[PDB]
């Protein structure tokens, strides 16, 4: 019952994360780079 | 939209792709702000009538309209070495960029090199500089004069004559070109 | 799949050019330009060494070890002995000096760095053969677990001059990669000649055959990535350079009483 | 027992001869087949078709010409010689006077036991439309062979360009639990002994499971530690962006 | 879209530019083969090309 | 027993002996080893990007 | 009929052949076309891998380069410039007078041919080498083909003179072509003739305007008492006089019988 | 089980049974006296003058009594302990038959040793006895349970009989059916 | 104008498999059809035809054969007219046919919709299956019907088309290769059902039943171990290179063991429910 | 290796080939004319003598 937590608590750390690395990447395609 | 979406990725028929994303611009009649940042997500994938139909179907509802940026979206389509691409590429600037010019937008200068250069070039394709050549008379149709206008506060609603007419484009090299009904389109300003 | 599948044919690598694009060297002799497979890179990828090829589509495949193997230099190469370790009485004097030569720098190698000496690359053997030779180290290599490979002073001997350095050249360079390997040398005198007249024609070769044994040996470092023994029969005068501790470490003399 | 192996080229044009004619259900087509029967897996390399006429209201009413057989062989052997007759195949389920008599004609001409196809030209109902059947007496038995698709290296290339998990099994493993409960019901109705004689026996295959329960949460906890790796999947996911998100703050600078 | 492009190429050798001819061809050195006059690439220039200079051929 | 010879575990009270198998476990923690070098070493290189 | 089975026979396709140069893996063998240039070719079934290794005559495929059938090993014409007969010819009524010497070498011989487990209980090894030297002509072919007519094993006949000649590695793959038809039919037994001329230990025992005596050498002595040996073969070697021999092949562990014919 | 041949007149039919009736007596292999039943042999002959042992051991395995049939039979075949020996196997035959569905409808399979006691006419010392009999006369396999006094049996011959036999097994049928409404619905929509 | 034919998905494939054993070894075939000049071509059945000691030719065409398949091909509809012939040649650089040259000439006086289809890769087939059509032109393309209207053309572009040698002319003034492929309901349902990916079918229910369950004995057998080698590939990569940088060589180390191991738990997961899924009748 | 047939061609390309019944066991021997594929080198039938490779310079007289 423990072990299937453990699970869900690893996961947990996917959707706070991989939507946050485009989340500033915004402002590098819209201003004018070198 | 969801639909003529699924038709366009889960079919495998490139011509059956081509023509869902040409119905979806005129879904989008009403708003032309937002055709160029759909067409340029699906401007990027493996197939090349993907990327030919949405060339086109870009300059529908952005012909009449403002928004001069989604030339920007068609650069790269012209680059494309398939033929029927760049054909179609070329009569969508032609759309977008009627009456663009005189320090408006600054791609009407490349657009009028690529008059004369596409036909005496023979690096091109062959109906890459077929089609340049009728872009270079929609600009100038009617004197500099008729321009496209679809869904705008002169008609009112959606025209009859304009809507069927852009609908018999999608249909050019595969049986003999179906352009006569492109003139329902165009009126004088 | 398509780029490997069924057929497959040998090729020699030469130069890159871009990512997934290189230019080798077929077996028929015209060179193509085939897709270097995306693994290799810079340091995985080979400078010069021969790999596999697509018949048609012409893409990259693998990279082939430096087979020596042939029908000309041939050179016999033992695999797993049966000959069991001490099964001779009297060497226990050897057999303290074999373990530090053997054993040692191919295993406990890492102690020699504890004192700050390279691995002694190799070992001097003298008497006839047949007694703590033949037997002996063929049992200790089962010890080790190291490749036995037998270069011999009258093997890889061929009319066809430069091929018999060639060979040695393939034997050593593929010995560098893998750390355990054994090469022993029987009757290190057949070598250990020299030119003592002009022969013309017939045998030219006495002098070829310590070119490239001494490069892989006097020419480089010192390092061990492989045990050269070698094994001395009957000389006198005879000084290739082989001798002394330039190299090889200890000389070990078959005890006559 | 016998292997038999059929190309996906046969079973394809197989039901394409019931559409062509618009063939109703009083007709039902006949056809045979060619391979090496020598073997104890039945290759089929190639197909044909036969005139056959057949009268639905009477079963005692057949045609079938062996002459056409005859010309027709006579062309193989300028093409192909290592194709000989393995058997034939007919259309449709049922099995009648008419079906079974025409097998013994076609043993003139083939050395070896007939293959027997009965070909299903509706295809209703899970796969393999066209089953694989033997002949062999104790009365003819029908007995059935294991069915593998199985063609040439050319011939498997090709079929792809035509066309260009666990949830899967879980929809027709419903489907086939309900149809075996028919298959019984039905059964029943035809008596008022031999299958239900076999399926006790198979059927028979928490006395001695008080502790056998102990071994199926052992390989569940080697599955948790997969699991675990998972978790080490997820701990290596949480790594990725993290080098890319490192870089955004890098672009800030620059830009 | 790059595996169908390079898988599909049939190969090219190296060779080395003997001389330049002004029918806009050159004489290229083949290894295995000899001296041949080939065509001259459209994004490649004939004058650029020297003596034992290192070209790639189809 | 006490130098790991021979397997097993004897009663001193009744007099009784127990079974006792040669291994007590496989490997499990041994994946932590890998886990915990990771984590000791990439952690503290993206706190040297970030700056 | 049989003229429409050769009409039949006319369709068929064949395919090439090749031997394995190296072995990359169990299912890829880099192997070398006879019509062609070097290929690395597959499997396709009935590939027996015991009996198929490196080095092992393959037949090719001119289409999709794959093995199909398993070919013996030959190189040289083992067939044409090595005699092979079966059992013997010479009987036993023109070696007599030896019966003496011969009684304790077919000990020695024929026995470990026919029950090789005699000697594994007493924990020894048989004689390898077996040497008969005398008068040229006399005693060297009856000799010969006596002992593989009360074996019953082949009649081998491999003389010495097809060994040194002007080429790059003759007597490299003399040997190991020799050693592979030994080793495909255990039943057989290799003779040769005048082995004078391809032996000597000159001073230091190397090579001194002589290509291709030290490679007979050293190769003949490395089959022996290498790791693989020949134990249902028998060498034999026939000469004027054993001491203008190499005393390095005399030496005890590969010919351990020496035998004058008067 | 033959229509179209081994065509007979009516008294052969009698004799063709009596070879079979003493060839079940001795040996119980092929399933027992009830599979003649529902061939055409022992409904095509008379009940009397010693054709009936057929239809006396078929009742009698159940009654248990075996002064019934040595009544009806003669002192040869009555001398020989074989024939009580093998007689008692289809005894616990038909109890061996009830331990794949017959009355747990939970899939258990439990067999105790007091229910094969008073069926087969044997004690309880002979229980572990007879047991060990049949094993290794190649009649049946599998194994017993000397604590709880339990038998586990493995593949055997299961007859051609009905009714209340394929009423339990396809009520089991139902419960595979019933999970499918269960956990099938369940995996369908996730 | 220039014909454009629709070859069904049937006989695609036979036309492929008569031709294809060996690579010098050339054969021939029939094909039949219903269709009408300009539009509405079809290619319907094919079979291969008996071949004389001249190979591909005219008269390697036997009638008294042909006129029995007629009779034999007409229960099941598939007997039609003849719409043309194909062969098989081993292939060169411009004329795959080595024999047949103007042959073809004797063809378009009995047929002039016939045409003669050779199989360029000859089992070098990438999966594109790409073949070569040949038309008769003799005089024409000049003031005449306009064959270029259709689909594809203007063929030559740089120094590939096709073959790649043949690049404008192609074989005989510019006969404008054109060919398509279609799917019917029963070809489509069938390819799936046996050829797709790869076949497991002809057992719905013990596809991943059987694969999954009865075989751990050959795959999962000592899972304990198989857990082991899902370490050795992290210790492969993780071991290597802990600094993000080039140092031991590595760039994507840590996700080639990611997607590698993501399997191996999801297979241990898709058995974990099916071995709930055995429903061994437990309840109480 | 028994029933089957091992024929080098001029072009110095082995071809190994199931023996046919067209062709004879003692029919085919080294030193003589066996006609075969220009293409796949795919022994057909054999021909009668007529030039042997007589190699002349070689004095005949009877």
Not at chain 4, 65 to 90: R, S, T, V
Not at chain 7, 28 to 56: F, H, M, Q, T, W
Not at chain 10, 25 to 49: A, C, E, Q, R
Request: aromatic fraction near 6%; charge should be negative; charged fraction near 25%.
């Amino acid at each position: 019952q423990v072990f299937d937590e453990r699970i869900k608590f690893a996961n947990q750390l996917h959707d706070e994360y991989l939507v946050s690395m485009r989340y500033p990447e915004d402002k590098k395609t819209q201003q004018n780079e070198k | 939209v969801k639909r003529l979406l699924h038709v366009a990725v889960s079919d495998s028929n490139d011509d059956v792709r081509r023509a869902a994303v040409i119905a979806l611009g005129f879904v989008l009649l009403r708003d032309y702000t937002t055709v160029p940042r759909i067409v340029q997500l699906l401007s990027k994938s493996h197939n090349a009538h993907v990327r030919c139909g949405t060339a086109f179907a870009l300059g529908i509802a952005c012909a009449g309209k403002g928004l001069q940026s989604a030339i920007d979206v068609l650069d790269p389509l012209t680059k494309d070495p398939v033929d029927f691409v760049r054909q179609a590429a070329m009569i969508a600037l032609s759309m977008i960029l009627i009456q663009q010019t005189e320090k408006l937008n600054p791609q009407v200068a490349d657009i009028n090199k690529n008059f004369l250069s596409v036909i005496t070039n023979k690096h091109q394709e062959g109906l890459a500089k077929f089609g340049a050549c009728v872009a270079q008379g929609i600009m100038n149709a009617g004197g500099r004069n008729v321009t496209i206008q679809l869904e705008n506060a002169d008609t009112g609603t959606l025209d009859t004559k304009s809507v069927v007419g852009l609908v018999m484009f999608s249909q050019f090299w595969y049986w003999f070109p179906l352009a006569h009904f492109l003139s329902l389109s165009f009126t004088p300003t | 799949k398509r780029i490997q599948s069924v057929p497959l044919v040998i090729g020699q690598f030469l130069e890159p050019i871009d990512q997934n694009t290189g230019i080798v060297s077929s077996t028929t002799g015209m060179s193509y330009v085939v897709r270097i497979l995306s693994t290799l890179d810079r340091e995985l990828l080979k400078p010069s060494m021969s790999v596999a090829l697509h018949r048609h589509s012409n893409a990259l495949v693998d990279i082939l070890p430096p087979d020596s193997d042939s029908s000309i230099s041939v050179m016999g190469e033992n695999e797993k002995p049966d000959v069991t370790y001490a099964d001779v009485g009297g060497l226990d004097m050897q057999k303290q000096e074999i373990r530090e030569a053997v054993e040692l720098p191919l295993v406990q190698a890492d102690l020699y760095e504890q004192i700050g000496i390279d691995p002694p690359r190799g070992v001097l053997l003298y008497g006839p053969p047949g007694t703590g030779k033949t037997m002996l180290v063929k049992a200790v290599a089962n010890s080790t677990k190291a490749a036995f490979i037998r270069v011999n002073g009258s093997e890889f001997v061929h009319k066809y001059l430069g091929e018999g350095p060639r060979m040695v050249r393939d034997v050593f360079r593929l010995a560098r990669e893998n750390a355990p390997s054994i090469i022993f040398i029987d009757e290190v005198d057949s070598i250990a000649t020299k030119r003592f007249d002009a022969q013309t024609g017939s045998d030219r070769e006495v002098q070829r055959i310590l070119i490239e044994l001494l490069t892989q040996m006097d020419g480089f470092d010192q390092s061990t990535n492989v045990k050269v023994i070698m094994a001395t029969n009957r000389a006198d005068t005879l000084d290739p350079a082989l001798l002394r501790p330039g190299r090889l470490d200890r000389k070990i003399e078959f005890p006559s009483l | 027992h016998e292997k038999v192996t059929i190309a996906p080229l046969v079973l394809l044009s197989a039901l394409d001869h019931y559409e062509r004619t618009q063939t109703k259900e009083n007709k039902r087509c006949v056809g045979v087949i060619l391979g090496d029967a020598n073997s104890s897996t039945i290759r089929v390399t190639n197909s044909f078709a036969l005139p056959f006429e057949e009268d639905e209201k009477n079963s005692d009413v057949w045609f079938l010409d062996h002459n056409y057989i005859e010309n027709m062989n006579e062309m193989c052997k300028k093409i192909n010689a290592k194709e000989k007759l393995i058997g034939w195949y007919h259309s449709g389920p049922k099995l009648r006077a008419s079906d079974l008599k025409i097998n013994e004609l076609f043993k003139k001409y083939t050395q070896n036991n007939p293959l027997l196809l009965i070909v299903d030209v509706k295809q209703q109902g899970v796969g393999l439309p066209t089953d694989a059947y033997v002949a062999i007496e104790q009365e003819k038995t029908f007995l059935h062979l294991p069915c593998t698709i199985e063609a040439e290296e050319a011939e498997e290339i090709g079929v792809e360009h035509l066309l260009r998990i666990r949830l899967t099994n879980q929809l027709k493993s419903l489907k086939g639990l309900q149809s075996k409960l028919k298959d019984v019901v039905e059964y029943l109705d035809k008596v008022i002994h031999t299958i239900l004689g076999k399926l006790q026996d198979v059927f028979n295959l928490n006395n001695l499971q008080k502790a056998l329960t102990v071994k199926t949460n052992d390989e569940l906890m080697v599955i948790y530690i997969s699991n675990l790796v998972r978790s080490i999947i997820a701990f290596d996911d949480l790594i990725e962006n993290k080098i890319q998100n490192k870089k955004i703050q890098e672009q800030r600078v620059k830009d | 879209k790059d595996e169908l492009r390079l898988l599909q190429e049939p190969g090219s050798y190296v060779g080395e530019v003997i001389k330049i001819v002004s029918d806009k061809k050159v004489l290229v050195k083949v290894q295995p083969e000899g001296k041949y006059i080939v065509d001259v690439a459209k994004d490649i220039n004939v004058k650029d090309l020297k003596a034992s200079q290192r070209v790639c051929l189809r | 027993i006490l130098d790991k010879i021979f397997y097993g575990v004897l009663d001193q009270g009744n007099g009784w002996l127990y079974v006792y198998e040669t291994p007590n476990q496989d490997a499990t923690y041994d994946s932590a080893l890998e886990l915990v070098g990771q984590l000791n070493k990439v952690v503290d290189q993206l706190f040297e990007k970030a700056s | 009929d049989k003229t429409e089975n050769d009409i039949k026979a006319l369709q068929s396709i064949g395919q090439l052949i090749g031997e394995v140069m190296k072995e990359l893996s169990e299912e890829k063998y880099i192997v070398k076309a006879s019509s062609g240039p070097r290929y690395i070719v597959g499997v396709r079934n009935s590939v027996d891998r015991s009996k198929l290794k490196k080095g092992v005559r393959v037949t090719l495929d001119i289409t999709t380069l794959t093995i199909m059938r398993i070919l013996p090993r030959e190189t040289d014409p083992l067939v044409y410039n090595m005699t092979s007969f079966e059992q013997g010819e010479i009987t036993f009524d023109g070696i007599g007078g030896l019966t003496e010497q011969i009684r304790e070498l077919r000990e020695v011989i024929e026995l470990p041919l026919k029950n090789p487990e005699i000697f594994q209980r007493v924990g020894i090894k048989p004689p390898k080498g077996v040497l008969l030297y005398g008068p040229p002509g006399t005693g060297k072919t009856l000799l010969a083909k006596a002992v593989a007519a009360t074996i019953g094993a082949n009649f081998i006949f491999s003389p010495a003179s097809g060994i040194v000649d002007k080429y790059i590695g003759e007597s490299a793959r003399i040997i190991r072509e020799m050693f592979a038809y030994a080793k495909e039919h255990e039943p057989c037994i290799i003779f040769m003739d005048e082995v004078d001329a391809i032996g000597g230990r000159r001073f230091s025992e190397g090579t001194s305007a002589d290509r291709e005596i030290q490679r007979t050498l050293m190769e003949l002595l490395t089959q022996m008492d290498g790791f693989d040996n020949l134990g249902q073969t028998k060498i034999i070697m026939a000469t004027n006089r054993p001491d203008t021999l190499d005393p390095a092949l005399l030496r005890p562990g590969r010919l351990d019988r020496k035998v004058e014919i008067p | 089980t033959l229509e179209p041949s081994t065509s007979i007149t009516l008294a052969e039919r009698q004799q063709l049974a009596y070879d079979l009736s003493i060839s079940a007596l001795l040996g119980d292999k092929i399933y027992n006296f009830g599979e003649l039943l529902h061939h055409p042999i022992m409904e095509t002959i008379v009940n009397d003058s010693n054709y009936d042992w057929l239809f006396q051991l078929l009742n009698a395995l159940t009654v248990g009594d075996f002064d019934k049939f040595d009544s009806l039979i003669k002192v040869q075949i009555s001398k020989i302990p074989i024939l009580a020996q093998h007689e008692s196997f289809l005894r616990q035959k038909i109890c061996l038959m009830t331990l794949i569905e017959t009355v747990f409808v939970k899939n258990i399979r439990m067999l105790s040793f007091e229910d094969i006691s008073k069926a087969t006419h044997l004690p309880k010392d002979n229980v572990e006895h007879l047991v060990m009999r049949a094993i290794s006369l190649g009649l049946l396999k599998g194994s017993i349970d000397q604590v709880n006094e339990l038998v586990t049996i493995s593949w055997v011959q299961p007859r051609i009989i009905s009714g209340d036999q394929i009423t339990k097994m396809k009520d089991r049928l139902v419960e595979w059916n019933d999970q499918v409404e269960k956990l099938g619905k369940k995996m369908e929509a996730r | 104008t220039k014909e454009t034919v629709y070859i069904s998905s049937i006989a695609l494939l036979k036309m492929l498999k008569h031709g294809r054993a060996g690579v010098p070894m050339e054969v021939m075939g029939l094909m039949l059809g219903e269709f009408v000049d300009d539009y509405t071509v079809n290619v319907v059945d094919v079979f291969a035809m008996p071949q004389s000691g001249t190979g591909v030719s005219v008269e390697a065409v036997d009638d008294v054969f042909q006129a029995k398949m007629m009779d034999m091909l007409k229960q099941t509809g598939r007997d039609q007219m003849v719409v043309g012939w194909y062969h098989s040649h081993p292939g060169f650089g411009c004329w795959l046919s080595s024999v047949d040259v103007n042959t073809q000439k004797s063809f378009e006086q009995l047929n002039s919709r016939a045409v003669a289809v050779v199989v360029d890769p000859i089992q070098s087939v990438k999966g594109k299956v790409v073949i070569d059509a040949f038309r008769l032109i003799d005089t024409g393309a000049l003031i005449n019907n306009l064959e270029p209207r259709q689909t594809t053309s203007n063929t030559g572009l740089l120094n590939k088309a096709n073959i790649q040698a043949l690049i404008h002319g192609l074989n005989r003034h510019y006969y404008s290769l054109n060919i398509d492929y279609h799917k019917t309901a029963k070809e489509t349902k069938m390819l799936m059902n046996l050829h797709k990916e790869q076949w497991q079918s002809g057992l719905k229910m013990y596809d991943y039943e059987e694969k999954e369950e009865s075989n751990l004995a050959a795959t999962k057998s000592m899972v304990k171990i198989a857990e082991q080698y899902s370490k050795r590939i992290e210790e492969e990569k993780e071991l290597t290179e802990e600094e993000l940088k080039t140092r031991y060589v590595g760039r994507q180390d840590p996700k080639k063991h990611l997607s590698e191991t993501a399997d191996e738990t999801l297979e241990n997961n898709i058995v974990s429910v099916l071995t709930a899924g055995v429903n061994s009748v437990a309840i109480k | 290796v028994g029933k089957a047939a091992v024929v080098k061609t001029s072009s110095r390309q082995t071809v190994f080939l199931p023996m046919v019944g067209l062709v004879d066991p003692d029919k085919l021997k080294p030193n003589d004319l066996v006609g075969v594929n220009k293409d796949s080198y795919l022994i057909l039938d054999t021909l009668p003598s007529e030039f042997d490779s007589r190699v002349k310079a070689m004095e005949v007289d009877e």
